[PDB]
Amino acid sequence: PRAKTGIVRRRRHKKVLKRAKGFWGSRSKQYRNAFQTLLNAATYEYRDRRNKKRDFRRLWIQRINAGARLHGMNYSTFINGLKRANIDLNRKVLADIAAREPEAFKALVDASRNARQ
Amino acid sequence: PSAGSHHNDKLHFKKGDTVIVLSGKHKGQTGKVLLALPRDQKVVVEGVNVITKNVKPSMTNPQGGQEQRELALHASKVALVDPETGKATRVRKQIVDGKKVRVAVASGKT
Amino acid sequence: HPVPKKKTSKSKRDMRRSHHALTAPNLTECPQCHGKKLSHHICPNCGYYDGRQVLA
Amino acid sequence: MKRTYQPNNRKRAKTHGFRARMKTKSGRNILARRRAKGRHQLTVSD
RNA sequence: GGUCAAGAUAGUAAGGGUCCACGGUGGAUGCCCUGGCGCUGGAGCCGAUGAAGGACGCGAUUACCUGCGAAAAGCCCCGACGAGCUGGAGAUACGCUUUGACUCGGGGAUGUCCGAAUGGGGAAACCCACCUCGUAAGAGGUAUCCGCAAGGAUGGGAACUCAGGGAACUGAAACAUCUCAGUACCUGAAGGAGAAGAAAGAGAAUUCGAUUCCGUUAGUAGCGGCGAGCGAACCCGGAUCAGCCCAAUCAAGCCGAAGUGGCUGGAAAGCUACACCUCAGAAGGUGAGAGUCCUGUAGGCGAACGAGAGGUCGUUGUUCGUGAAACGAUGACUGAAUCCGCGCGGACCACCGCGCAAGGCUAAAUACUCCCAGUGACCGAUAGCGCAUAGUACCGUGAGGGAAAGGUGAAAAGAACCCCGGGAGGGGAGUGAAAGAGAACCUGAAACCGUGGACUUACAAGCAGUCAUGGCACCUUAUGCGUGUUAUGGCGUGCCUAUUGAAGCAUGAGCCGGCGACUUAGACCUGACGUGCGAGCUUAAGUUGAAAAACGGAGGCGGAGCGAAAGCGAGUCCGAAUAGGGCGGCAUUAGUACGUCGGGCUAGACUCGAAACCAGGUGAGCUAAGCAUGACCAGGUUGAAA
RNA sequence: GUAGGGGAGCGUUCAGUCCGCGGAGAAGCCAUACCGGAAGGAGUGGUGGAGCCGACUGAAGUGCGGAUGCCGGCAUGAGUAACGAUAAAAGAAGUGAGAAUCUUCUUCGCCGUAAGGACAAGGGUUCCUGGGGAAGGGUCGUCCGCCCAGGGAAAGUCGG
RNA sequence: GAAUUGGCUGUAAAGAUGCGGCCUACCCGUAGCAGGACGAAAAGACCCCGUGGAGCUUUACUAUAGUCUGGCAUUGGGAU
Ligand SMILES: [Mg+2]
Ligand SMILES: [Mg+2]
Ligand SMILES: [Mg+2]
Ligand SMILES: [Mg+2]
Ligand SMILES: [Mg+2]
Ligand SMILES: [Mg+2]
Ligand SMILES: [Mg+2]
Ligand SMILES: [Mg+2]
Ligand SMILES: [Mg+2]
Ligand SMILES: [Mg+2]
Ligand SMILES: [Mg+2]
Ligand SMILES: [Mg+2]
């Protein structure tokens, strides 16, 4: 008995192909090139996934120190005084608190000032 | 390429017999046998029809036209079936002809 | 001997062919036989170009 | 220039000929072998 | 709200991108069979009454095949079938046939020319003769080779068999003996089979009894640069079994049991409600899926005619390579007995034991598959033979090589008629279930070419992505957990191999499809797991059944080790007894058969790739020369001997 | 985590058994936002016109991106290079669906020890006549050495 | 291989359009040029490697056609 490769390779390749959308030119059209693109695509996917958390870390900091500097502190000073109060484990996403809510971050700045001198 | 030569290509019916139609269309409808073609298993019966045109680019009053023609058929039909419907006859014998067989199911006359 | 290095792309070739658009004849109605013919030429239809010239 | 092939009726025949191919038995070998090999026809008809 | 100023900001797409929609190109995939493949079985030679294979002919119309053969797609006799027939052929015309055509069997009858070719010649199918018979037309004879004569042979055959002749690559990781292997190749002879055969034997029992074949002995006994490697035979189990002469039933075929109504449908053999046969439910066909619709099947019958010696020298064979080399076999030279005789038993002698050479024949068990049949955890259109027929097209002076190849529809109903056009091609009409089947006619993938739409793009440095947010658009796993597109930000050195190290300016590759590489075999070896019996465990060939498996103890493995062996034995070895090697006891360690898998060995051994080596043939129509025989060199200048 | 060892599995063909599905439509093919730890597998939709899932076991010609791998088809270069001798053409006329290319006329240029003529060898109806316009013709084509049909070849003395 | 294919300087398997930093640069063509794409072409013919090959050579090894030579055979007689 003999089992040809019939109807197998094709389904496989279409599965590969289908991931490809805004993929430019032969990347979205020819198989081998597509699949191959999806190797490096693997790399960037996973690695930059672990990375995105570094990225948002960066963003929020970049905001918080901004509000801080606006009110007379800075990130070093503000977070120092915050931690210096066992009070605020506030920490995470405090950025938006500084962005949307002016008087709140004014109270946090004043408070963190108390916890310094 | 095969083709109707399946059977031993003998014929259960004859050129002169009256026959009705098993299955098909014109089921139950009947007619005299006109052409019996054994090899290609093709039976012409007077009852079953096709209305069909011939091509004359210029031929025989070129003036194209359409005919009333006969619908040629397969083994679907029954030989001379006496009690007023189709029935499948086998047995043979001889009566007034010692040189020949005959046919029936329940009856004896075809 | 100076061969091309890569197949040029669908996009690059279709880009080069960008300029090949045919420039459709600007036609004009013949004043005499009133059918459309061309400037500074004889109207093929009537044969009339300022009075009448070709045997039509 | 002048090619390899200079067609000759009394040559193509005097060698390769069924007669010629029958003159020797390595020839007649070629014959019957050619026969069984399907119908591969011998030069008098070729 | 009008003009100055300073700002910011949209849109346009020449062309591009992504997605979507719709075509085109192509022919993958699914379906199918009109074709293959090998298993088992059957059958097995044809030709001087002319083979095999062809040439040219034959047809109302004939180019290809088929079939024949100047009596030509046929002719006559017998048998069967009993309405059709007039070959593939689609096609008009002419007809033939119950005074039995056609078709199927069975004998004869004609059979052009070539070819063993055979009157003579010849570049096969052609050119020339002679002797008879005589009325021309036309028939008959005229090769050599055996023989009184009758008669026999020359040729052909896929594989198989015997024989004359006889390779190398390769292996020994180099290479001479060795291995490849008496393999391949050539040649001779012949049949359906051949070969072989009726003991001057095998052999160690005062056993056996022709040959061949299978299992087995047995990877044993042996041969070997004792290297690589090579490798019996007797016994025993089976298949089948004979020894005789001589020299003083199966083919044509015929017969065959049993269903109707309603329903979906284009169409039913399907569903359904009731019913029937079955020494017949194996199978194919019939508009779809079939016992009871056709052919069939089980069963039954069935014909005129037809089949069923010794030595020496050079050497060689078998396990036998010169080895202690016996024996058979011969090329040369030699060339004994014959019945108180003669050859053998592995140098040789005696004894002892088997055996009668120098003459022939001789079914069966065996091998093979051109052909036919039946089957298949065999292929199904890049598969399967190369061919769904082709050794054709096509390549070559030739020997030789060598293709792709399939699908309307259930039925031609194969599309009158109308419209654009010379046409091609399309659009209507009509048929049809379907023309979403229309003859570039099953599905119709991907590359690749277009048309339309959506969001987008004309200060931007780019492995084409990935992440994150915004804009626009869409809502059939689908109002979000979204899908499509996009603007900006962040990040970001193709894949593969080969490598110390690859984005590499190192390999490979245009793109998509399909083809495409770690197998198979043996009663081999060794392990893991699993089963069955278990101090025991199994069979091999074969025999008999064969919708099935049983029988078969010849043999193999355990069961005792030690040694160079004789031998001895829970002991055995070396040696004059004590030291040790091996080992049994163990404190206790069970096997064998089968299966799957992990390896090993022998074969191509994962697939692809050499330069080369050897055998048999084809080539001097190109070119290198010879031979025989022909042809050719305008015109002018120079001015030798005599 | 590379060679390498070990374990679980996914898919394809055939096979036996079981459950079954199909003209109110099978396989295949096409789209898809769902499921699954992955190989993968479902759901609905669109094509299609006969067949086919699933479970359990068994057997493999059983899984491709590469091998300058094989067959086929289709791209790139790109409407690029070329159209095969630098012996030139020109006008009228005709035909035709359509003519720079066919026909005729009138000129022009080219060979003229040839680029004329007659045979051999070889080719095999290419000749003539009448039609044709798919392909062949390097453009065109009404034309041809192309396609169709019918005709044509005559020897006592020439060559055998 | 696919490309959406600039410049300098540096780094990288040591000669970067594709890495870094800095400069430059609107979109698409046509005629041209040959510096780069270690541009194409041919599994480098040089060199080395292979217990690869083949032609040739000779006082390398080994065999052998051929040839010389003793005996035996055809192959006999007589004198000495
Ligand atoms: Mg535009
Ligand atoms: Mg050698
Ligand atoms: Mg070797
Ligand atoms: Mg189609
Ligand atoms: Mg790979
Ligand atoms: Mg160019
Ligand atoms: Mg140019
Ligand atoms: Mg043309
Ligand atoms: Mg140039
Ligand atoms: Mg180069
Ligand atoms: Mg090299
Ligand atoms: Mg050289």
Curated annotation (Swiss-Prot), chain A:
GO cellular component term, pick one: cytosolic large ribosomal subunit
GO annotation (BP), single: translation
Keywords annotated in UniProt: Ribonucleoprotein, Ribosomal protein, RNA-binding, rRNA-binding
UniProt xrefs under CDD domains: Ribosomal_L20
GO molecular-function terms, A-Z: rRNA binding; structural constituent of ribosome
Gene3D superfamilies reported for this sequence: 6.10.160.10, Ribosomal protein L20 (1.10.1900.20)
Entry-linked SUPFAM superfamilies: Ribosomal protein L20 (SSF74731)
Pfam families: Ribosomal_L20
Subunit structure comment from the entry: Part of the 50S ribosomal subunit. Contacts proteins L13 and L21.
Family membership noted in the UniProt record: Belongs to the bacterial ribosomal protein bL20 family.
Record function comment: Binds directly to 23S rRNA, probably serving to organize its structure.
Protein name, as recorded: Large ribosomal subunit protein bL20
From Swiss-Prot, chain B:
Alphabetized Gene3D superfamilies for the sequence: 2.30.30.30
CC per GO annotation: cytosolic large ribosomal subunit
Coiled-coil stretches: none
Single Gene Ontology MF annotation: rRNA binding
InterPro entries: KOW, Rib_uL2_dom2, Ribosomal_uL24, Ribosomal_uL24_CS, Ribosomal_uL24_KOW, Translation_prot_SH3-like_sf
Natural source organism: Deinococcus radiodurans (strain ATCC 13939 / DSM 20539 / JCM 16871 / CCUG 27074 / LMG 4051 / NBRC 15346 / NCIMB 9279 / VKM B-1422 / R1)
Keyword tags: Ribonucleoprotein, Ribosomal protein, RNA-binding, rRNA-binding
Task performed by this protein: One of two assembly initiator proteins, it binds directly to the 5'-end of the 23S rRNA, where it nucleates assembly of the 50S subunit.
PROSITE patterns: RIBOSOMAL_L24
Protein name, UniProt field: Large ribosomal subunit protein uL24
Nuclease in keyword set: no
Gene: rplX
Domain of life according to the entry: Bacteria
Family: Belongs to the universal ribosomal protein uL24 family.
A Gene Ontology BP annotation from the UniProt entry: translation
Curated annotation (Swiss-Prot), chain C:
GO biological process, one term: translation
Record GO cellular component, one term: large ribosomal subunit
Superkingdom per UniProt: Bacteria
Record carries keyword Plastid: no
One example GO MF annotation: rRNA binding
Pfam families in the record: Ribosomal_L32p
UniProt cofactor(s): Zn(2+)
Span of zinc fingers (C4-type): 30-46
Binding site for Zn(2+): 30, 33, 43, 46
Textual note on the cofactor: Binds 1 zinc ion per subunit.
Region feature Disordered, mapped onto this chain: 1-31
Keyword terms, alphabetized: Metal-binding, Ribonucleoprotein, Ribosomal protein, RNA-binding, rRNA-binding, Zinc, Zinc-finger
InterPro entries on file: Ribosomal_bL32 (IPR002677), Ribosomal_bL32_bact (IPR044957), Ribosomal_zn-bd (IPR011332)
Signal peptide: none
Composition skew (Basic residues), residue ranges: 1-20
Family, as annotated: Belongs to the bacterial ribosomal protein bL32 family.
Subunit structure and binding partners: Part of the 50S ribosomal subunit. Contacts proteins L17 and L22.
HAMAP family on file: Ribosomal_bL32
Function: Forms a cluster with L17 and L22, and with L22, a pair of 'tweezers' that hold together all the domains of the 23S rRNA. Interacts with the antibiotic troleandomycin which blocks the peptide exit tunnel.
Name the UniProt record assigns to this protein: Large ribosomal subunit protein bL32
UniProtKB/Swiss-Prot annotation, chain D:
One GO location term (cellular component): ribonucleoprotein complex
Keywords: Ribonucleoprotein, Ribosomal protein, RNA-binding, rRNA-binding
InterPro entries in the cross-refs: Ribosomal_bL34 (IPR000271), Ribosomal_bL34_CS (IPR020939)
Gene Ontology BP, a term: translation
Signal sequence segment: none
Quaternary structure note: Part of the 50S ribosomal subunit. Contacts protein L4.
Protein role: Binds the 23S rRNA.
Family membership noted in the UniProt record: Belongs to the bacterial ribosomal protein bL34 family.
Protein name: Large ribosomal subunit protein bL34
